[model samples]
Target: MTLNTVALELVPSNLDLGTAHALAELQKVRKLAVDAGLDGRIRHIMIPGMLDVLDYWELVQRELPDVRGLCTQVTSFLGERSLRRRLTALIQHGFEGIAFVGVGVAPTDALSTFSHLVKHRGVILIPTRDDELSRFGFKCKEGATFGMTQLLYSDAIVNFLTEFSRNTDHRPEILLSFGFVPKMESEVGLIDWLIQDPDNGAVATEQQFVRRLAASEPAQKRAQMLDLYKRVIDGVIDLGFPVSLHFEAPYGVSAPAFETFAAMLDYWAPD
Candidate 1:
């Protein structure tokens, strides 16, 4: 197995926590990536407070550096007006990357507008998921970096990704990052407990957390899911495609879970 660089994708729980908290969390994530032997190559960072902080999107644009290759996914997980501000802010901020926030699971005009924006600005647009790619009228042009959600099985994932790449010219210039974690009963419970409020104080964030977790099925189904990802990744390698596993939420996972996962990946070699 060959190793590829890993990037961290964590959204801070508190937008009100301010940049201090955001930077701290980013450091924690960066440290995690470094500890895992991924240094000087962590590619993207996503801020989680997309909806909580009012006008946070524009704020991100203005505050963030222009040279950083960050993809701020704009979503109405908060609302339309706010999302709009974020999309425009990202453009204004001169962010080199743009993702449709939550277009994969939820559709948004951000995609349509992004096409126009990219054409107008002569900028590169990298979508975060395959579903988002479908919304594009033209091939995802060059300068795109794609990050896909978790995979339960390899065949479907391998087929979908390879096929998608086959038909398009953009072909995402960066190593494809598809996040996957073995779903487990305890992990599911951890998600619930972590996001749950003792007094229901963080109801909104809790609701968002639940909505995100809902994508996973019965807790016991994780083994099969993990296996699927392995097979899919293997399939991608076997098919002569360059695919990389970019783990997200490594903290939410148990030590043993990652140990086993890493061991399996350690032997993966592209054919």
Candidate 2:
């Protein structure tokens, strides 16, 4: 139950330009992690939401075979037959795992029903959501083998795991997700959406994340953000559940941000 595995999400937004060009960008960091010898600590590459995912999947499995990858599908957008057929295509491609994201209100968003569709399925759980604990139980009962929480910037997750442990023994391998140290005001504005949480009035009340010319530079924000990630991860571990860690680009990938991510993993699980 200790921090068993780690993952980095590689969004295929670049694929629309073409697969090879897309893989080229991903491979830059792939080599970065491999050369640094951090490959073993990694769980896999999480490539989410693309119909042409097979093309990239094969390329990834071809080179970075040591860490298998998890392709994703947004369940809320696809109809049943549509999703079922896609799963079959993926299965035929020798793919057996998936991370299903439930975000829309369409019939396909029936999270429980869709979760049971895959043999090795997982779901995205938002620890910041007030009702998440109850949602975790139902999703687990429906056959979600794993769960990954959304990015957290506060101890809200401690409240989550605290109650989660207080309630049940049904914790699937939850990946405590964190990411992105916004270096631009534009980026900061984008991530500011976190302030809408049930608690913001709740920052001293959401305790809204803020700072100054100290902000004109990402140097301080980056370190402070790292502190939050460590703090929250410690909170989860202190409870004795020992959840895994997952990092992502909530604002998309940046070598600067990815470097921060790699450094933290190095400190967290160094040999």
Please report the candidate that would top TM-score against the real structure: 2
Residues 1-271, candidate 1: write the lDDT tens digits.
1223333344444556776655554445444444544443444343333433324334433333221334446354745566556556665754444544442223334444455453221111223233544643242332233433332222445555566666664443223333333345234544444333355333344334343434555343344444545665566655443444444443442343333344445555222
Each model's RMSD to truth, in Å?
10.1, 4.1
Q: Clashes in model 1: which pairs? A: 1-267, 1-268, 11-48, 73-101, 74-101, 152-228, 153-228, 154-228, 154-232
Q: How high is the lDDT of residue 188 in model 2?
A: 58
Instruction: List model 2 lDDT by residue over 173-249, tens digit each.
Output: 67777766464635456555544564434333223453231253667666776677677766666675546677777
Model 2 misplaced regions, further than 4 Å: 1-3, 34-37, 62-65, 76-82, 92-96, 103-119, 185-188, 194-207, 210-219, 238-242
How many clashes (backbone N, Cα, C below 3 Å) per candidate? 9, 12
Candidate 1 Cα errors over 4 Å, as ranges: 1-5, 15-24, 48-69, 75-85, 91-94, 101-109, 116-147, 150-154, 162-187, 190-230, 237-245, 250-271
Quantify all predictions' global Cα lDDT against the true fold.
Answer: 0.42, 0.64
Q: State the TM-score for model 2.
A: 0.77
Candidate 2: lDDT of 47?
73
